[PDB]
Paper text:
Within this work, the possibilities to perform SSX at BioMAX, the first macromolecular crystallography beamline at  [name] IV Laboratory in Lund, Sweden, are described, together with case studies from the SSX user program: an implementation of a high-viscosity extrusion injector to perform room temperature serial crystallography at BioMAX using two solid supports – silicon nitride membranes (Silson, UK) and XtalTool (Jena Bioscience, Germany). Here we have presented an initial integration of two SSX environments at BioMAX in order to collect diffraction data from micrometre-sized crystals of membrane and globular proteins at room temperature.
SSX diffraction datasets from galectin-3C crystals were collected using XtalTool supports and silicon nitride membranes with U-turn continuous scanning and an average data collection speed of 100 µm s−1. The crystal size did not exceed 20 µm and the X-ray exposure time per image was 0.05 s for both datasets. The second dataset from galectin-3C crystals was collected using silicon nitride membranes.
Numbering used by the authors: 113 to 250
Write the structure that this text describes.
Amino acid sequence: PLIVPYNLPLPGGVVPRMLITILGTVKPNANRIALDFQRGNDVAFHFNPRFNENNRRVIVCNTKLDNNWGREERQSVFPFESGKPFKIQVLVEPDHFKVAVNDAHLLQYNHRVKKLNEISKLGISGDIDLTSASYTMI
Ligand SMILES: OC[C@H]1O[C@@H](O[C@H]2[C@H](O)[C@@H](O)[C@H](O)O[C@@H]2CO)[C@H](O)[C@@H](O)[C@H]1O
């Protein structure tokens, strides 16, 4: 449905209790998915399932400040499956983004970018069909 890369405005930025739900389907032979929670040019939270990083599936999380990626946080747990529908839920908590994929907690990403209200765009890219990207307050 939705065009990828998709930019989901997060009006007024993120706030704890904001739940962002991304439904899509990983393309066959997907290489990557990326969610980029952006604070302007900075990526407050880059959530980057990599389907083939040295023949491993890994989730790389990072923050890009001033065009410099920070310390990657890597999660070996990889709930995405090429070709398959997924649901990513990013719950903004006070101290971290909490990411659940297909209703299973996947990872937390401590806020490195502290101005949550300035994290006002979510870029959704990569090898997905994007069915829906929405947010709500829980
Ligand atoms: O850190 C997220 C960021 O990673 C970049 O790739 C890194 C790669 O993860 C690392 O193993 C290597 O040593 O450096 C690369 C360049 O910084 C991706 O290019 C970028 O898109 C993000 O996913």
